[model samples]
Structures are given as C-alpha cells and as structure tokens.
Target: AARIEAMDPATVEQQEHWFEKALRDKKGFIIKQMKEDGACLFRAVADQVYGDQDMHEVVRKHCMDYLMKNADYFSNYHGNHIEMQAMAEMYNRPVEVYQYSTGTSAVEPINTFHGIHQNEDEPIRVSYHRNIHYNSVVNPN
Candidate 1:
C-alpha cells in the first residue's frame, strides 16, 4: 500500500528508528520532518523550496500541471520520474533523494539521482522509505 501519512508510534516506532539511525551516516545534514499527509512528496520539496511544508497544496497543484504538459511515460506518476523531473525543472534545479536501504554501523541510505548529477545551487533533498513515504532532509546552512 502506498502511504504518506504518519501513524502513531505503535508500528511507527520501527520506521522512526530506521529513519533516525540513517542520519548518523549523513554527518551535518538534518531532517525537517514533513506532515505525513498524502502530500508528503510535494511538502518535502515545498519545505526545501520556501521553508514551509504547508505550501504542499500549491506545490501539488503545480506538479499536476507539470505532469500533464509532459504526460508521456510521466503518466503513471513522487512522481516516478517525470513528476520528479518536473519538480527539478519548475524549481530550476535538481533534487537529491536518499533511498532507505540496509543500514547499520557500516551500512547507509541508498542515494538516488533525479534529473541531474548536481545543481547550480544546492539541490533539494529528501528521504524515501519503503519505496513510498518521503521526508525532507536538509543541510543546516
């Protein structure tokens, strides 16, 4: 089941645990937890865009528009690829994704690339877990 909402800490405890542990591998980066609403993907990028996850509504709307304009393989729609590619184009930069992977004292989050290898400025960052839910991970400055 695809998901974005955050549930109470019963089963969430493990998810939280995994998310938290993945950070040490990140060194100076920090996470800005987004509201677990279905807008998690948009909000994660929204938070990075203007420091407000609440703007997710508008972001999603814009993404939908972007999707239609390029609705080729992008039809399936965080946006598979075109959706994410739209995010990069609309924002005028690339996005960095940290895919949840086997982690430990030695293991770490799997990194995924969006439309580009690097951005003219720092790229937006987010964490993808269970191949569904997404959350933003940002640099302090």
Candidate 2:
C-alpha cells in the first residue's frame, strides 16, 4: 500500500484498478515496488523466465559475461542486444524480435549458445522489444 501511495495519484488509481481486476479474475501478477532502478529490465525478464522476482543479479551477471565473451558481435551499447542474447542463451530458447518502423517491418532471430542443449523436451518462448521499445505482456500461469 505504501508503494502505491508513493506513486502519483493517477498512477496509484490505475494500479489499484489493475490489481482489483486481476484479483477479481483470479489472475497472478506482481506489483514491483522498487524504484525505476537500472535493473528493471533484468528484473522483469527474470520474473518471466524463472517466476522469481529477485533474480535480477543473476540475469545481470549473465548479460555481463556474455558481453565480455562476445565482444566482437557488439560494437556499441545502443540496444538491448547483450541482455536479450544472454537471456536467450540461458533459457535455451530462440528469441524472435520484430522491428516496426515507418513503412518497414523486419523480424530478427536470436539463437541460443552454439552447442548448448541442441534438443530439449520443452522449450520456453520469450519475446521482447520492437524498434527500441520494451513492451512486455506477462504470460499467465
């Protein structure tokens, strides 16, 4: 409640409404109370992939390690490539990214690490980002 109160009036009302609807529908969702720290993206991904909200550090470490090891693939830190690639490799699934701009549409693929678990019984599907926007829709449990 304190976290909601700390938000602006409009946001607090919106969040309250969302929570009420979620509860009424018997849905599961997490209300992140932390400020918009630098690890929001990592935290959100960790929550989706592992169903654990406190695994941001793990995600961050994987991203950092991947970036250091594959310095050739990255030139500048412009997009979320490093983090997204690390998540793909860690989860052992391919990430399909769609980019939409003024009159152009493109789909890009981020495959898992070279020789890790080439075949798995069950694969997880995770998608994020479109043209530099991080729009996420949480999956139901």
Candidate 3:
C-alpha cells in the first residue's frame, strides 16, 4: 500500500522483523490503535477486561461515576487513578502494572478487591506508559 511504501525503510524492516518474531514465538497478538484524544488508557483497559475496545465510552462513564461516588477515597490520589480503579472494579479483577525504568524494573498492583467479590482468576495484564496503547493478543486455540 502507499502508506507502507511511504514508511522509512529501516522502520519497515524493523516492523517486519517484529512481525516475524511474533509469529515464530507464538505471540499471536496485534496492536489495536486507540483514539489519539484523551481516554486512550480507558479504552485499552476496556479492551483488556471486556474484549471490546470500542467500549471506551462505557468505561469512561463508569470512571466518572466511580469518582463521584468515592470522591473521598481518591481525594488525594491523582494521575490515572480514576481509569485504573474503575477498570478493576468493573471487571472485579486486580490490575498489575509492570514498569521499566533506568536499570530497574518493578511491578505495581492496583485496585485490589477482596472477599467473595474478588477476582480469583488471573489478573488482566497491561503495559502502561507515557503513551498508552493496547496489545490485543490472541488466545491459544
């Protein structure tokens, strides 16, 4: 396609390598592009939790409702607090975020729910960074 041809040769080669590796390594996932506007993180979470990337608005509404209902809990919290918490509660699952920094890496847990309502299954994994996006991987057949 014209767009592919317009891409830098090195970038295209790198992408080709990545694609081949993914296939060879049994990583049957594809990147799903989210809207460039705000709420991209919410959209990624929705895709992870509900298998529907288009449910961003649904996730957004819930996030707003959560903030309103639990204003006190998040009064001092800032930055991605609303979206992360809402996604966890919406799916009744904890979210584990893995971060890579200079010479160090760490995994942080957020929005943990306990008791009978807690998520007993494996938690949904997401890679959150400055520019958030979703990696929709295919499940093994």
State which candidate has the highest lDDT: 1
Query: lDDT for each of the candidates?
Result: 0.65, 0.51, 0.57
Q: How accurate is candidate 2 locally (lDDT)?
A: 0.51
Q: State the weakest 10-residue window (summed lDDT) of model 3.
A: 101-110
What lDDT would candidate 1 get against the real structure?
0.65
Decoy 1 TM-score against native:
0.63
Give all candidate RMSDs, comma-separated: 11.1, 12.8, 11.8
Which pairs clash in the backbone of model 2? none
**Residue 113's lDDT in candidate 2:** 27
> Residue-pair clashes per candidate, as listed?
1, 0, 0
Instruction: Give the alpha carbon lDDT tens digit for every residue of 1-141 in model 2.
Output: 877566656655564555445533552322334324552367666665677758878877887887778777655553565666665676666543322122322122233322245665233323332212258899898
Over the stretch 1-141, how does candidate 3's per-residue lDDT look in tens digits? 877665657655565455445434553434454556663576776777688868878877887887788778768663665556656675667665533332221223323432226646656555444442468899999
Off by over 4 Å in 1: 1-15, 18-25, 73-79, 103-111, 116-118, 130-141
Tens digits of per-residue lDDT, candidate 1, 72-111, equal: 7565654355556778777767766765444553223344
**Inter-residue clash pairs, candidate 1:** 5-36
Clashes of 3: 0
Candidate number that wins on lDDT, 1 or 3? 1
TM-score of model 3 (CA atoms) = 0.54
